[PDB]
Amino acid sequence: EGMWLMQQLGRKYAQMKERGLKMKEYDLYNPNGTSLKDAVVLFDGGCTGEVVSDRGLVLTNHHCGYDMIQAHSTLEHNYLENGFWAMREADELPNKDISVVFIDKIEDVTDYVKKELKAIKDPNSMDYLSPKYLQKLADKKAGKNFSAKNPGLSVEIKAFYGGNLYLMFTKKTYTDVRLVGAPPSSIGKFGADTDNWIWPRHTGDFSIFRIYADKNGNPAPYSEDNVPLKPKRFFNISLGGVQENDYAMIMGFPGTTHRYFTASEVDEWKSIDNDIRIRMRDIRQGVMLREMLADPQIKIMYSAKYAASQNAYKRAIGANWAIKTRGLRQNKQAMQDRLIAWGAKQGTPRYEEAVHEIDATVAKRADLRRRYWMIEEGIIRGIEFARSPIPTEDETKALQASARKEAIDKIRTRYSKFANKDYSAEVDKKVAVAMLTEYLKEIPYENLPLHLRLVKDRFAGDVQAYVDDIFARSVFGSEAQFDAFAAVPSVEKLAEDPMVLFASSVFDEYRKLYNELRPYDDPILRAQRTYIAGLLEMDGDQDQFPDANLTLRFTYGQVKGYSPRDNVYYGHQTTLDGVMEKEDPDNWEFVVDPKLKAVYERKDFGRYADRSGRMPVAFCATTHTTGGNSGSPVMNANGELIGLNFDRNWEGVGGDIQYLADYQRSIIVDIRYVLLVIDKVGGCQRLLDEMNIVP
C-alpha cells in the first residue's frame, strides 16, 4: 500500500520477507554503508533512473529522456524517430541542464528541527515548512564550509507527516550526463497519447544515459576531459523474468500524495478541481477536435495542444471515477470520526478542533476556489488569446528618445510567439466563444473580469460579437493589423485595444483570486500538523506512510493483473504479439518499427523470450507509485532489475488519496524487452557486454 521512508525499512522488512523478499535488509538500504539504494538517482529533477553498470550507465524512461533526444535531433540525424545508439563512449552526446542526484546519506533530524523551532514566539509561523528556514538549519547542522570540504555533496532538510518528522539528505549531484541509447519513438512511445494511463500496455518506454565525472569520480560540469563514473553500486539485470504473484519492489521519488485529506477536501477536489477541469477541457477539446478533423492543416497545428489538454483531463476522469465508486470520501470520514472518538476518550480536543478548522477553511474558500478554477481552466489555459501580448511599462514609456522602435520590436517578437506557425485565430475564436459561453453562465456579472462585463453592457449578451470585435479591432487580431499599428504606434491605441484589455483584466482577476486564496492554505497546513500527529499517536507510524514530497521511497507488492469491470480480466504481462495486433500503418501512434516486426516474424528473441517462447513487453504490479516514479527500477526478491516503472492505469490515479488494491497498478516495461530492443533493434552490443546480466 505505501510509499515508505528508507528509515521505515527496519519496521517493514519482516512483512516484506513474508511476501518473498530474499535479500538482507542492509543490502537493500544501509544507513552507514553501501547498499542497492546507492544505484537509484533522481533523473533531471522529475524522474527516477538507476545505474546499471560499473561505467555509470543509467536507465530511465524514454518520456524522461525525451527532451534530450529531441535537442540532439536534426533533419540530417532524426534521433527522436530513428532512435540513437552511440557505438563508442566517445560518441555519447552531452546534455545542457541535465542532473542526476544520488542520496548519499539520510538522517532523522526531527528533534534538532523541533528544538530550533521553539525559538519561534509566533505560534502560527510557517517556518516549520519553509525551505529557506530548513536550509538555514541544514547548513548549521552540516557546517559553514560543508560543500567545499565535501566536493559534490550538499544537504537538504524536508518536512514529513505535515511537519511531525524531518529528514536531512546528503545529496551528490552530477551534471555531465550523456545520451547513450534510445529506441525509435514508434517503440519508446508506441501507444503515444491513446495508451497514456492504459493497461494493457505495449510501450518500450526506456532510454539510456551515462554519468561522467572527473578522474576521481567527483561531480564536474561537461568537459571533453571527463570520464565515466565508476559507481559504488549498480543493478544486476535479471533474465529470469516474472510470474504472476512474484514479489516486486520499487525505489524512486514519488512527487505528491494527499493521503490525509479530510472528507471535505475529497468533496472539494471532486466538485471544484476535477468537475471544472473535466467540464472546461471537454468543451475546449470538443471544439479543437471538430476543427482538427475538418482541416488537416489545423490537425498539424493543434495536435500537441490537444494532447497537452487531454493528459490531466484523463487523470481527472480517473480520480472522479475513484471518488464515485471506491468510497474515498466515506473512508476519510471514517478515519477522522475514529480519531475524534479516540481524542474524546483521551480528553484531548485538539484533534477534533483541527478537523473542524480544515472543514471551516474548505467551506469558507469554496466560492473563491470555484472562481479560480473556472478562470484558470476556462480562460488562462482555455483561450489562447488570453496569452496575447500585454505592453510592459518600459514599452508604454518609449512609445510615449526614439527607442520607440525597440519597444515595437519587443512587442513584435511577443506577437510572433503568440500568433506563431501553430496559431489559428479562427480556431481560437470558436474555442473562445464556447469557453466564454460556459464561463459567463457560471460566473455572475459582479465577479467577471472587468472586460467581460462588455458582453452584457455593450454586446447585448452576444458572445460571438464580443469575440469578433476583439479580433476586428485589436492590433494583435492579424499580421496586417499589427503592421498598421507598428507603422503609427500610439499608447492610446494599446491602452484601449480590446485584446490587451481582455488579456489584462482576465490576468488581473486570476492574480486577485490567487492572492485572496493563498492565506487559506496556512490554517489547513497548521491543522494538518495536529491532525497527522493524532493519527500517528493513535494508530502508529507503521501501517500509514508520509505523503510523497519528491524524496526517495520504497514500495513493494506483486506482479498481478486486475479486473477493470464485470467479467473482464487484464493479466499481469503483455507480449510483442500485443504490439503487432495494435499495428496500424496509417495511424502515426501505432506504427511498428520494421526491425522489430522482422524480429517478431522470425521469432529472433534469443535469451529474452519466456518459457512459452513468447516475447514479453510489459507487466503490472501492486506497488504504490505516483508522478516522480517514472523511471524507477523494479526489483526481484533478490534485488535484481526486472523492469522500469513508466506509467500507472487511470483506475489507480485516485491512489494518491486512497490506495486501490483491486484496481491500482504500476505499469512496468519488462527488462527482457529493453535488452531485446538494445540487442536486435539498436545492435548496441557494447551496452549488453558492460551490464552484469544474471543467468
Residues that bind its own copies (CB under 8 A): 200, 202, 290, 293, 325, 561, 565-571, 573-575, 577-578, 581
Phi, psi of 672 (to 5 degrees): -60, -40
CB 431 within 8 A of CB 287: yes
For the chain, the first-to-last Cα distance in angstroms comes to 31
Neighbouring CB atoms inside 10 A of 79's CB total 20
Task: Select from its own copies, Cl ion, none the partner in contact with residue 578, using the beta carbon and a kind-dependent cut-off of 5 to 8 Å.
Answer: its own copies
Catalytic residue among 35, 44, 62, 63: 63
87 in the Ramachandran plot: left (φ > 0), alpha (ψ -120 to 50) or beta?
A: alpha
State CA 503 to chain mean position distance. Answer: 28
Dist CA 414 CA 396 (whole Å): 15
Q: How far is the CB of 529 from its own copies (least distance, A)?
A: 40
- Nearer Cβ to Cl ion, position 171 or 414? 171
Provide the mask over 563-582, with x wherever binding to Cl ion is found by CB under 5 A and - wherever it is not. --------------------
Q: Which one among 77, 115, 350, 397 touches Cl ion, defined by CB under 5 A?
A: 350
Dist CA 6 CA 168 (whole Å): 12
Q: How far is the CB of 326 from its own copies (least distance, A)?
A: 12
Catalytic residue among 264, 630, 632, 666: 630
Task: Select from its own copies, Cl ion, none the partner in contact with residue 348, using the beta carbon and a kind-dependent cut-off of 5 to 8 Å.
Answer: Cl ion
**Is residue 388 among the annotated active site residues?**
no
Q: How far is the CB of 321 from its own copies (least distance, A)?
A: 10
User: By CB neighbour count within 10 A (0-12 exposed, 13-18 middle, 19+ buried), where does 531 fall?
Assistant: buried
Task: Select from Cl ion, its own copies, none the partner in contact with residue 404, using the beta carbon and a kind-dependent cut-off of 5 to 8 Å.
Answer: none
Q: How far is the CB of 381 from its own copies (least distance, A)?
A: 24
H or E stretch at 557? strand 553-558
Task: Select from Cl ion, its own copies, none the partner in contact with residue 414, using the beta carbon and a kind-dependent cut-off of 5 to 8 Å.
Answer: none
Query: CB-based contacts of 353: which residues, under 8 Å, 6+ apart?
Result: 530
Q: How far is the CB of 565 from its own copies (least distance, A)?
A: 5
Of 668, 669, 677, give the one whose Cα is nearest residue 600: 677
Nearest-5° angle of CA 20, CA 24, CA 26? Answer: 135
Task: Select from Cl ion, its own copies, none the partner in contact with residue 518, using the beta carbon and a kind-dependent cut-off of 5 to 8 Å.
Answer: none
State CA 303 to chain mean position distance. Answer: 21
Dist CA 252 CA 238 (whole Å): 19
Dist CA 183 CA 128 (whole Å): 45
Dist CA 663 CA 650 (whole Å): 9
**Assigned C-alpha cell, 307:** 494532447
Does position 662 interact with Cl ion (CB under 5 A)? The reply is yes
Q: What is the CA radius of gyration of the chain?
A: 27
Task: Select from Cl ion, its own copies, none the partner in contact with residue 202, using the beta carbon and a kind-dependent cut-off of 5 to 8 Å.
Answer: its own copies
**Is residue 273 among the annotated active site residues?**
no
- Nearer Cβ to its own copies, position 422 or 583? 583
Q: How far is the CB of 186 from its own copies (least distance, A)?
A: 17
CB 171 within 8 A of CB 102: yes
Task: Select from its own copies, Cl ion, none the partner in contact with residue 660, using the beta carbon and a kind-dependent cut-off of 5 to 8 Å.
Answer: Cl ion
**Is residue 63 among the annotated active site residues?**
yes
Dist CA 95 CA 308 (whole Å): 25
Of 89, 95, 30, give the one whose Cα is nearest residue 65: 95
Does position 348 interact with Cl ion (CB under 5 A)? The reply is yes
- Nearer Cβ to Cl ion, position 69 or 660? 660
Helices (H), 633-684: 671-676
Task: Select from its own copies, Cl ion, none the partner in contact with residue 574, using the beta carbon and a kind-dependent cut-off of 5 to 8 Å.
Answer: its own copies
Query: CB-based contacts of 508: which residues, under 8 Å, 6+ apart?
Result: 449, 450
Cα torsion angle, 494, 497, 499, 504, sign: positive
- Nearer Cβ to its own copies, position 287 or 470? 287
- Nearer Cβ to its own copies, position 530 or 573? 573
Task: Select from its own copies, Cl ion, none the partner in contact with residue 488, using the beta carbon and a kind-dependent cut-off of 5 to 8 Å.
Answer: none
Identify which range of 71-79, 485-493, 579-587, 653-661 contacts Cl ion by CB under 5 A.
Answer: 653-661
Q: How far is the CB of 303 from Cl ion (least distance, A)?
A: 35
- Nearer Cβ to Cl ion, position 426 or 662? 662
**Assigned C-alpha cell, 284:** 475546449
Provide the mask over 214-253, with x wherever binding to Cl ion is found by CB under 5 A and - wherever it is not. -----------------xx---------------------
Positions marked active-site? 63, 205, 630
Sites of contact with Cl ion (CB under 5 A): 231-232, 348, 350, 660-662
